């Protein structure tokens, strides 16, 4: 068990500030980049920020939507990553997750913040399968073909907003992920295949694609497993 234990959310006023924390255990935190990702009704899953290692002088990158307002930091001696959020707006409302490793294997449980090149990655809205079937989800980029240079990741969301990474780096299964999950590139899209779908695989699947220095998440596919 890896744990990423988050705190710091709440209910704040437009223009206010808030600092989120995330404490890691069960893996060598200081060897891996860390990310913040948020989920909102309005904007689906959205990558927010990354921080690299001590050996990279803790280099940071930010989504355009938060640049200048948010600051990511880490404290390797406390195995913690932080997000300072200034000048909050209604559109920053959502559930905030710290995540990393290969490249999104491990997700925190989420903390709610309520404030009161324009790439689109497209997934099937829904697919319906049955136990024992082979089902393939796909992930298209508005920029052209998906290649291995987009380091496709696949992540699974189960009820109450619980995320786990399945696949990183196009086709590398994250540790302890069931063998029925695999990743591929098929006709210039990234693809996740479940070979023998199980009832427990009913969930929302997201892909993420890398573009040089940032991630873009697809809108997610709702997979129903009937029968």
């Amino acid at each position: 068990q890896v744990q990423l234990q988050e705190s710091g959310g709440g209910l704040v006023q437009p223009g206010g500030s808030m600092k989120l924390s995330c404490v890691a255990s069960g893996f060598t935190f200081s060897n891996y980049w860390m990310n913040w990702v948020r989920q909102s009704p309005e904007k689906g899953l959205e990558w927010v920020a990354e921080i690299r290692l001590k050996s990279n002088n803790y280099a940071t990158h930010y989504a355009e939507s938060v640049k200048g307002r948010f600051t990511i930091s880490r404290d390797d001696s406390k195995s913690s990553v932080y997000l300072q959020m200034n000048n909050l707006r209604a559109e920053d409302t959502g559930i905030y997750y710290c995540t990393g490793v290969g490249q999104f294997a491990y997700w925190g449980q989420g903390t709610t913040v309520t404030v009161s090149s324009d790439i689109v990655v497209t997934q099937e809205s829904a697919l319906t399968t049955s136990p024992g079937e082979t089902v393939t989800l796909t992930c298209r980029s508005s920029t052209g073909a998906v290649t291995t240079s987009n380091y496709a990741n696949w992540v699974q969301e189960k009820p109450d907003h619980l995320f786990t990474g399945l696949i990183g780096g196009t086709n590398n299964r994250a540790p302890g992920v069931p063998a029925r999950f695999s990743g591929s590139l098929i006709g210039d899209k990234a693809a996740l295949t479940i070979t023998g779908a199980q009832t427990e695989d009913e969930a929302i699947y997201f892909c993420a694609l890398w573009y040089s220095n940032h991630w873009v998440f697809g809108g997610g596919t709702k997979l129903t497993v009937l029968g």
């Binding site: 060897n31 891996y32 980049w33 690299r52 990393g100 490793v101 290969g102 490249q103 240079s149 380091y151 780096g169 890398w210 991630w215």
Partner: peptide, 6 residues
Amino acid sequence: APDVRP
């Protein structure tokens, strides 16, 4: 690349 460390 992103964090390709195993």
